[PDB]
Structure 1
Amino acid sequence: SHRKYEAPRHGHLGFLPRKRAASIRARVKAFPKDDRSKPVALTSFLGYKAGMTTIVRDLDRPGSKFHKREVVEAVTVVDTPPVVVVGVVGYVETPRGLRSLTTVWAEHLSDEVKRRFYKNWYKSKKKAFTKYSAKYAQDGAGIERELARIKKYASVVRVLVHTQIRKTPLAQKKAHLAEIQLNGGSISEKVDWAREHFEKTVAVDSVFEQNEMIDAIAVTKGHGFEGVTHRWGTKKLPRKTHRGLRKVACIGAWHPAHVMWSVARAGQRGYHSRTSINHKIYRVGKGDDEANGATSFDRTKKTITPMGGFVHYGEIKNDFIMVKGCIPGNRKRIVTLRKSLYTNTSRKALEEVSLKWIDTASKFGKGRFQTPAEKHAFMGTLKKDL
């Protein structure tokens, strides 16, 4: 039978598998279609979320209530350290497993990728890739020959890179090895691209342009073994009820005798990975880039450094990337970016940018003055300080 008539679903699930994040790296299984017309361009990227702010932008969109008015939403500025290519590995297709042997790394390895392999940094004798660095001493019979196979007996190329932590305020002291696929002309302009780009930073005058639809993948925050009550949505029994007042609703299944799949209770509300798409790049910033707070109303030289700090960060010392909208999953961990998969509907890329007033006040307390020099000037010389 039924109560009234079946009723909706508050115990409705959403993730068949799930589980706790046994790795800081998400599960990237989606890759854009390889194009031959467009030059060598990346498909994925790395970075770290900084936080959110309040940016005033003239709504060019023909709203049915606002339109051309001073309105605000919620955007994020993902920070990204100077990514340097230190590994060139190419592949072909994806049958039932990996299928290659042409793995080319580097020689000048810093103290960032040498900590990823070993938990105990002190026990490490700093002697990694010793048998690989000895191949550069000779003519290179096992190096240059490998590149001759990629130019013919290969297809896709996943460049192995990492993130600088020596200038990153994030207390981790370790780089993040990932895989980035690049699509360009033919199959020989893929391996030779990253080959001639050793010990180099991220260039914004080749691939990275203005207003590009990108994606965002981060890591979700968990809360322990949270039960059906808060994890899904269970009711609250009155105080008159005994032995419980917020316990799980009586299931009463049968449907096969093996109790159903969606009668779930306690597990892990969060601590996984998400996937966000359709995001336009507002402004590409750098590490030594000044005058970040370009206000088109007050005209004052200022940055976007948070006057308070969110949680586990710093005071902006790397290349920040301001993108449209926000991103699921908490920060303080590696965030794998991604370019456009294909000709998406978007239905919002028609509107460009119109950013003016940029917020840079307090993030820990209440929003007051944007610049600390303004408060000092309004106060003047008194007892303490100047």
Structure 2
Amino acid sequence: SHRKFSCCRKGNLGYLPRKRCTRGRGRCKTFPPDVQGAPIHLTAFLGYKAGCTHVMRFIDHRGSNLHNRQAIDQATIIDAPPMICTAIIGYAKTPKGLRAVTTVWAAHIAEPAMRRFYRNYFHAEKTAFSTYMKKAADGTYIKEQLGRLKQHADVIRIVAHTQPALTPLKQKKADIMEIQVNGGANVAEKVDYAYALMEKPISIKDVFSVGAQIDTISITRGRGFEGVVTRWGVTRLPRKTRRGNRKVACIGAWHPANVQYTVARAGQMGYFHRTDTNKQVFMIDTAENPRCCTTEFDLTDKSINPVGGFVNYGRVQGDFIMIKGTCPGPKRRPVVMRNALLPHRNCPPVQLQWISTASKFGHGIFETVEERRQFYAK
């Protein structure tokens, strides 16, 4: 018989299977589309999730009920030390998709990159790029090998790695990622730009800008094995059910005589690969600047690290970026950031009047250590 009252299904079938992610980190699967003629620019960066705070900003909208008023917004903080570009890869568009031409590495490779090639570093015998460094010593080989990417490739990407000795993390090996070069006048102009970045650092202020939108890619918090009420959000059965009320009662009709893939079942919850889109950039600064988080509205000097320190992260030493809202993962997961594929259209500008630097360990009420000391001055 027909189900008597109308009600939708529970949960989204386009995020199946609910298995643990097997990719290692967030992997950028698409890049923004290249526009022939546009100025050259980079499209991606890799950071680590540091914390959350909230800000006061002056809203300049039109037709909105907050048109000339003040709003308090939640912002997330991402730690972004400079990345080092170590290799150039090219690909060709073929009747079988993207196929690569060759990958040209740099002459000299750093310790953080070399450690990613080994399981244990102290014990291993070190024979990565042993022949390559000898041949590539004279720079002529690179020029010849770049003489192919200019002649056969349609898409150019750079290989770049992070420097984990400038963070509070525990790992010592880098995270390696391809970054696509968009824009330019022809292919041959994008290889002169990639060569001029070889073995050099890249700052996040030279990819993203303030007020633009980005996409954040990461792996979500894990909860392990979990039943249907929490994993899927189905209704809890009444109190006098004999064997427990945290279940789906009927898991299929008699025919077909199988269990369907559309029925809610228990299993792994969390630790999934996800993409949250259209995040607006609030501020790009550095933690060495002691005036990075000071508006006029306060007169003291305030910087990014809070009183007490970033709970469960550590101390931020260099560059960071600030996005509105929230992003997947716990503190310290690596987050990939790209330009927005289909950005939201009617977003107002960014005009910050105040940022919270009070302690997040507990309920802190002092912006700075100096004025807590003045408060308890004996």
TM-score over 0.5 for the pair: yes
Q: Which residue of 2 aligns with 1:82?
A: 82
Mark the CA change 1:272 to 1:82 in structure 2 (over 3 Å): closer, same or farther.
Answer: same
State yes or no: 1:265 paired with 2:265: yes
Q: Is the 8 A contact 2:44 2:207 kept in 1?
A: no
State the shift of 1:139 in Å: 6.5
State the shift of 1:169 in Å: 1.1
Q: Which residue of 2 aligns with 1:278?
A: 278
Q: Is the 8 A contact 2:106 2:199 kept in 1?
A: no
State the shift of 1:167 in Å: 0.9
* Residue identity opposite 1:184 in structure 2: G
State yes or no: 1:146 paired with 2:145: yes
Q: Which residue of 2 aligns with 1:375?
A: 372
Q: Secondary structure at the match of 1:149?
A: helix
Deviations 1:322-376 (A, max 9, x none): 123322333422111101336x44221xx21210111011112113111011010
Structure 2 counterparts to residues 93-242 of structure 1, below 5 A? 93=93, 95-96=95-96, 99-138=99-138, 140-141=140-141, 143-185=142-184, 186-203=186-203, 208-242=208-242
Identity of aligned residues (%): 48
* Residue identity opposite 1:155 in structure 2: D
* Residue identity opposite 1:256 in structure 2: P
Q: Secondary structure at the match of 1:189?
A: helix
State yes or no: 1:306 paired with 2:303: no
* Residue identity opposite 1:373 in structure 2: E
Q: Secondary structure at the match of 1:84?
A: strand
2 CA distance for matches of 1:260 and 1:222?
Answer: 26
2 CA distance for matches of 1:93 and 1:287?
Answer: 42
1 CA distance for matches of 2:84 and 2:139?
Answer: 26
Query: Which has the larger displacement, 298-307 or 75-84?
Result: 298-307
Q: Is the 8 A contact 1:41 1:182 kept in 2?
A: yes
- Match for 1:353 among 344, 347, 350? 350
Alignment length, in residue pairs? 377
2 CA distance for matches of 1:264 and 1:291?
Answer: 52
- Match for 2:360 among 346, 358, 363? 363
Q: Is the 8 A contact 1:218 1:330 kept in 2?
A: no
Mark the CA change 1:11 to 1:29 in structure 2 (over 3 Å): closer, same or farther.
Answer: closer
State the shift of 1:64 in Å: 4.7
Mark the CA change 1:55 to 1:233 in structure 2 (over 3 Å): closer, same or farther.
Answer: same
Segments of 5+ residues of structure 1 without an aligned counterpart are: none
* Residue identity opposite 1:267 in structure 2: G
State yes or no: 1:253 paired with 2:253: yes
2 CA distance for matches of 1:235 and 1:72?
Answer: 35
1 CA distance for matches of 2:262 and 2:310?
Answer: 37
Q: Is the 8 A contact 1:53 1:74 kept in 2?
A: yes
Structure (1 or 2) with the greater strand fraction: 2
Deviations 1:90-146 (A, max 9, x none): 2122653652342111233222122222222222233321111011245744x3221
Mark the CA change 1:353 to 1:6 in structure 2 (over 3 Å): closer, same or farther.
Answer: closer
* Residue identity opposite 1:273 in structure 2: H
Mark the CA change 1:138 to 1:378 in structure 2 (over 3 Å): closer, same or farther.
Answer: closer
Q: Is the 8 A contact 1:235 1:249 kept in 2?
A: no
Mark the CA change 1:16 to 1:333 in structure 2 (over 3 Å): closer, same or farther.
Answer: same
Q: Secondary structure at the match of 1:337?
A: strand
2 CA distance for matches of 1:305 and 1:340?
Answer: 28
Q: Is the 8 A contact 2:82 2:203 kept in 1?
A: no
1 CA distance for matches of 2:112 and 2:255?
Answer: 54
Q: Secondary structure at the match of 1:237?
A: coil
Q: Is the 8 A contact 1:219 1:331 kept in 2?
A: no
Structure (1 or 2) with the greater helix fraction: 2
1 CA distance for matches of 2:77 and 2:148?
Answer: 41
State the superposition RMSD in angstroms: 2.4
State the shift of 1:46 in Å: 1.2
State the shift of 1:206 in Å: 5.7
Segments of 5+ residues of structure 2 without an aligned counterpart are: none
Query: Which has the larger displacement, 112-121 or 63-72?
Result: 63-72
1 CA distance for matches of 2:233 and 2:197?
Answer: 52
State the shift of 1:63 in Å: 6.3
Deviations 1:254-305 (A, max 9, x none): 4633321111312222211211222222221124222122133122211121
Q: Secondary structure at the match of 2:216?
A: strand
Q: Is the 8 A contact 1:90 1:191 kept in 2?
A: no
